[PDB]
Design a protein around this nucleic acid. Structure first.
Ligand SMILES: [Mg+2]
Ligand SMILES: [Mg+2]
Ligand SMILES: [Mg+2]
Ligand SMILES: [Mg+2]
Ligand SMILES: [Mg+2]
Ligand SMILES: [Mg+2]
Ligand SMILES: [Mg+2]
Ligand SMILES: [Mg+2]
Ligand SMILES: [Mg+2]
Ligand SMILES: [Mg+2]
Ligand SMILES: [Mg+2]
Ligand SMILES: [Mg+2]
Ligand SMILES: [Mg+2]
Ligand SMILES: [Mg+2]
Ligand SMILES: [Mg+2]
Ligand SMILES: [Mg+2]
Ligand SMILES: [Mg+2]
Ligand SMILES: [Mg+2]
Ligand SMILES: [Mg+2]
Ligand SMILES: [Mg+2]
Ligand SMILES: [Mg+2]
Lengths: 141, 150, 129
RNA sequence: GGUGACCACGGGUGACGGGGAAUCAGGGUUCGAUUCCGGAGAGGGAGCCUGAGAAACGGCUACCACAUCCAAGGAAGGCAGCAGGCGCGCAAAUUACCCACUCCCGACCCGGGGAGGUAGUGACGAAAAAUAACAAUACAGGACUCUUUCGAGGCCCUGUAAUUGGAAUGAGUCCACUUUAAAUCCUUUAACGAGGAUCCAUUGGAGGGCAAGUCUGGUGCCAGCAGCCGCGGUAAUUCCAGCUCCAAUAGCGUAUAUUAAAGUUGCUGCAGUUAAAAAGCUCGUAGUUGGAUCUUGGGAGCGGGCGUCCCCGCCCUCUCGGCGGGGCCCGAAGCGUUUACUUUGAAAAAAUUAGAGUGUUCAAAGCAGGCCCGAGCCGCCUGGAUACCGCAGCUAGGAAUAAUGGAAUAGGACCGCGGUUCUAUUUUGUUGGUUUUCGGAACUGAGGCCAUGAUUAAGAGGGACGGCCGGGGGCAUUCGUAUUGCGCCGCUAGAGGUGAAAUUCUUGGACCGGCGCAAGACGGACCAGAGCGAAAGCAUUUGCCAAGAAUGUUUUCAUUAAUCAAGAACGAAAGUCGGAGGUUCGAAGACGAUCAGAUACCGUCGUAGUUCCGACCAUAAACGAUGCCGACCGGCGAUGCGGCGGCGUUAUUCCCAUGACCCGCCGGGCAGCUUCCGGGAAACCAAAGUCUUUGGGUUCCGGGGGGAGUAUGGUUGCAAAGCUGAAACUUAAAGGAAUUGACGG
RNA sequence: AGAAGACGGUCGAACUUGACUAUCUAGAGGAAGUAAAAGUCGUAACAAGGUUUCCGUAGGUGAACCUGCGGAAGGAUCAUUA
């Protein structure tokens, strides 16, 4: 059992903070390795330059091509794969453009049947992908 | 349970509720004292004095008849041993095991019991230091104990 | 070894009450035990108890009335002030209507209602309801 | 010398500290660059002048890094001030007006203030609140009513489409006023200003979680959707649209940090047999935790009414008691321990929080405000509370719990009496001589008194003693058959081995039978849900050596105790080193078989090893997959040891013991059966119970599955390896117990 | 009264060198872990999985794995008779 003495507070707190390192959430947010390994560096979004347009295969029970773009972040110069989350927004994407990529939804974890993709594109050429999809505003042609 | 053994024996002496001296006992307080003085000069430990008095002279408790304990009686006269009786016997057992152990090096069991005995020696010695029975610098040396006891 | 004599007496009468025994014998008696048994009697939770006097720590036989539910102990005797007493009340007592928290104060051993009546905190001992 | 496991020192911080912010049962977890207080800095360091005050930078000097002008001889720099640019970025405003307010500076009613105020940008965020209301017609609905369905109206509410159909209004234009330093905005208030009142609400969804379609048209495992389950391969409730519904609403969606949910960090309050998990075992220092016991009972009218309730009052001492000599009194000194604890009081910035008052037109706010004016009201009444403020420090009451002490070689308390050395004042008032035991302080001798002074001996522990008990340990010794080999003797052609064979041994006598010899192992049957040991483990006889549990105890000591980081002892088997020995078996290896192949299972050999001594290694499914100490909570029959009782049988003897049985009791073990103790997911467990009715003490240790007991560092080892021990990345399950079915060489 | 200047002292920037310590990162080659291919080879584990399985240790083998020694039942026996 656990100690219950009147002057065992030091043992209780020392044991607590030693055991707090054994759950992933505390280890992740207090070690710093996850922060360094994060391509975004603790940022909600990141701008980048479209390096290529690539297609990713779905998982086993699905069968589709997920239209993603390989992007290099303007800060730290890291190369990541960002999903394009609409039906025909890849055509809205061309080569060498600024794209505001954001996390896909669950904190650096792969989402759905897309393997290894944890980011999605939000804006391209400083105009929203939703606005282009809905026709609210057109490309800066 | 036992300090250095897995054992939970309840074998203990049970003192009577009657603190009064039995009316048949005819030895008075001084008579117990001089019997105690005699047997102590003979070279008997206080525990050995109590058993002989109980088994032969019919005193169930020395403290009940004299009002004072056996070791207190010896120290008051001044013939109590310097080493406490229980501490003396622990060193005696430790020396005997040491003597046996040097003849029989392969007795890993005898070595194990030796550590248990010397652990009890140090724990008892700490208590006696705290009560100031023993000198504050009294150490149990494995080498010099063979002459300290026996 | 035995370290909390009160904790052992409370557990013994709790187990005996669960089984349904008319009487229970708690082996090591002490002053705190007698006072703790006294407050239970004055609130009617237990019947007569008799302290058997041997020259050692005596024994106690308690007549269980069967109207007890739990008589636990709070082993680390926390210091309870008058401002955190209600936080102990709702944490331990089943309800605000019945149930008693017994704490040792400088005015003696008594329940929380009376301790508050004479405006004094103290050290938590146990509870019963 | 000083500081350290009560964590020193060192390292990191995406650390300025605090008041405070978010979340909100309680406890907590995060956040505080940011307007108030304190600190620090002015590109990085360093050094100085002046001054009361600076190591000042809208002061100077120097160096470093940048950087400006130059006639190239020199000279001049510091926006982490207000604006405003570049860069960096996911990310953040006008190179505006004014000292009118609040205050600051100055020689000062007069000047100055990018402090600060005002305006501009401003969906950071917060408060209020439009996008419509009503009436009469049609058609349903209502407990409708009138005849008892039928039909109507003496009523009510919704809905669809209409020359309805004339009432109310702002949002907009815009006059003036007001506001203000000057404006703006707001509030006032003119004239306009609503029938798709087109003066047009959006953002996300409609399989489930989760409110809303099993509509229609496209696409056809494609496009795509989908936080998770999942949808789509031609009849999509899920994609792309239309229609229609749903949610919130001037706001809604997404990403990320953080809180609750999370009793998935568990102090409150989690777990550890099988799910992840208790160290192989014991000792042990720090740490944590520790049996019982020292004043209770009796009083007074008051008194929760002696109204036996009980406001309650309780029926420490010595010193001037300040109302050298009064009882008419209450002030000076110490505590006949020291703390923890609890209550009270003091002091604890404001702002923020809770909260008192106050109709801001309500609210967020703010600290304002209210009464009358008949016009003299030549002015009256207020508020600007209070609470909390952790821990530490200060103060006064209480003394229950907890710690700590007093008298044990009395070097003890208290009353005095001796004998000893100094000394403020003395007055044996002219000074000087002074007596000053004078007053108290110096040390010491002899007394009385103290009820003279030691709580008890834990169903706590240690130790002693008694008779036993045990495959407990070490050394020596003895015996057993078997196995292998060898020597003779006999008779024989086979023997061995396998599912079947074969490798192999054999007319030299193999196998078999007999008598011997030698060696090295191993201690059968007895042998058990029996014993002992800390575990590992321990089984031929005998002797020696120490050790031990339990029991017995009217012995002794008297709390000496429990668990324990660090450290230490012991640890099957295999493995390593050195020396002996090597019968059997047998990793490696060889061969014969089997097989589709057969690096194997089977067979014949056979090395290391297996045996002993010495030294390492420290691991096992080291298992009960189950920490230790302590208490409580059913029954029953046995078993081992010790003790205590008893009808009898038996051994001898002439009787008791004493052994062997028989029937019980007690204590301590190994277990078993049983039970609706209770627990548990259940299997099951008298513990794995006494757990939301959660707290006996204390160790170790788990936090979805993998990566991984891996990499690296450290350390131990001759080596093999041991101990300590991540991350990146990946994944929606992996698992546990039970049910049904299927299947089983 | 006194300026330039000089010896010495003291704070001491800065430069050169060396050391230590932090992160980041290249690297021939080597050796792992993950995900998808009804790819190849066998069949080690599950039933007595066709040699019960598993643990520790050691050697061996294309691969799973095999074998020796000790252990466990989480076994395929809670049981086998005087
Ligand atoms: Mg910082
Ligand atoms: Mg701050
Ligand atoms: Mg400064
Ligand atoms: Mg001045
Ligand atoms: Mg400066
Ligand atoms: Mg509108
Ligand atoms: Mg749809
Ligand atoms: Mg949370
Ligand atoms: Mg859990
Ligand atoms: Mg497990
Ligand atoms: Mg200790
Ligand atoms: Mg106590
Ligand atoms: Mg043959
Ligand atoms: Mg071994
Ligand atoms: Mg060897
Ligand atoms: Mg062989
Ligand atoms: Mg414990
Ligand atoms: Mg894990
Ligand atoms: Mg190579
Ligand atoms: Mg196998
Ligand atoms: Mg198999």
């Amino acid at each position: 059992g656990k100690c219950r003495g009147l002057r065992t507070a030091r043992k209780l707190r020392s044991h607590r903070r030693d055991q707090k390192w054994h759950d992933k959430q505390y280890k992740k947010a207090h070690l710093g390795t996850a922060l360094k390994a994060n391509p975004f560096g603790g940022a909600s979004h990141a701008k980048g330059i479209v390096l290529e347009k690539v297609g990713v295969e779905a998982k086993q029970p699905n069968s589709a091509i997920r239209k993603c773009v390989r992007v290099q972040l303007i800060k730290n110069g890291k190369k990541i794969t960002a999903f394009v989350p609409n039906d025909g927004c890849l055509n809205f994407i061309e080569e060498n453009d600024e794209v505001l990529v954001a996390g896909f939804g669950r904190k650096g974890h792969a989402v759905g049947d897309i393997p290894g993709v944890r980011f999605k594109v939000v804006k391209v050429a400083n105009v929203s992908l939703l606005a282009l999809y809905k026709g609210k505003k057109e490309r800066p042609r | 349970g036992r300090m250095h053994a897995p054992g939970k024996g309840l074998s203990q002496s049970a003192l009577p509720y009657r603190r009064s001296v039995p009316t048949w006992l005819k030895l008075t307080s001084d008579d117990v004292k001089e019997q105690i003085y005699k047997l102590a000069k003979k070279g008997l430990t206080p525990s050995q004095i109590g058993v002989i008095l109980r088994d032969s002279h019919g005193v169930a408790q020395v403290r009940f008849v004299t009002g004072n304990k056996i070791l207190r009686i010896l120290k008051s006269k001044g013939l109590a041993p310097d080493l406490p009786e229980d501490l003396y016997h622990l060193i005696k057992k430790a020396v005997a095991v040491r003597k046996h152990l040097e003849r029989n090096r392969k007795d890993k069991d005898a070595k194990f019991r030796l550590i248990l005995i010397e652990s009890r020696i140090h724990r008892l010695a700490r208590y006696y230091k705290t009560k100031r029975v023993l000198p504050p610098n009294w150490k149990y040396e494995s080498s010099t104990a063979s002459a300290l006891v026996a | 070894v035995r370290m909390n004599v009160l904790a052992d007496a409370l557990k013994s009468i709790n187990n005996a009450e669960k089984r349904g025994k008319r009487q229970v014998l708690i082996r090591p008696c002490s002053k705190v035990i007698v006072r703790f048994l006294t407050v239970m009697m004055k609130h009617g939770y237990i019947g007569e108890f008799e302290i058997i006097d041997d020259h050692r720590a005596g024994k106690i036989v308690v007549n269980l009335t069967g109207r007890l539910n739990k008589c636990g102990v709070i082993s680390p005797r926390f210091d309870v002030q008058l401002k955190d007493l209600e936080k102990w009340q709702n944490n331990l007592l089943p309800s605000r209507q019945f149930g008693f928290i017994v704490l040792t104060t400088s005015a003696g051993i008594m329940d929380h209602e009376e301790a508050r009546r004479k405006h004094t905190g103290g050290k938590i001992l146990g509870f019963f309801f």
